[PDB]
């Protein structure tokens, strides 16, 4: 349940389904206690049933939708697993490595099989942590936080 821009909030479609269930179930209890004409009890137990289907797996009996604006299927629990909207495709499409990089490539004639030439600039970012400590090792910086600020701006690197 997050804050976006100004007054715009954004939540997982799951939450709507949950309320669907919660309310019905509550209405149920009230409905049994307050007295109970058969028709209405069942009619609800029905709804209640459908509701339970909803968060578990929508579309298997009908398609529940968020109020007018998006006739979108509220991502049922399984939709999130299997990835009914190409989520599986994206999933095995890859996660995100923390120490990575990307740039154009250019032939390195004198380079040796053994090696490859990479922009020091990129190296800095990539091997930042390892660099920070080496800085402390040397007189370059007093400490980590120091070494970091020291590198926070291009023009400030000895």
């Amino acid at each position: 349940m997050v804050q976006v821009d100004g007054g715009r909030f954004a939540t997982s479609d799951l939450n709507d389904l949950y309320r669907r269930l919660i309310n019905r179930n509550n209405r149920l209890k009230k409905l049994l206690a307050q007295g109970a004409p058969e028709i209405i009890i069942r009619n609800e137990k029905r709804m209640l049933q459908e509701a339970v289907d909803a968060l578990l797996d929508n579309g298997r009996r009908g398609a529940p939708v968020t109020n007018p604006g998006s006739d979108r299927p509220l991502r049922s629990l399984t939709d999130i697993l299997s990835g009914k909207q190409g989520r599986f495709r994206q999933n095995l499409l890859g996660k995100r490595v923390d120490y990575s990089g990307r740039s154009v490539i250019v032939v390195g004639p004198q380079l040796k099989l053994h090696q490859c030439g990479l922009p020091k600039r990129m190296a800095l970012e990539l091997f930042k942590p390892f660099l920070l400590k080496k800085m402390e090792e040397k007189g370059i910086a007093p400490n980590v936080k120091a070494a970091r600020r020291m590198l926070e701006r291009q023009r400030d690197i000895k």
Binding site: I39, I40, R42, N43, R46, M47, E50, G62
Partner: peptide
């Protein structure tokens, strides 16, 4: 079988 109708029929 698609709710609505059944209960409508039900108490009607």
């Amino acid at each position: 079988k698609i709710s609505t109708s059944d209960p409508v029929r039900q108490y009607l």
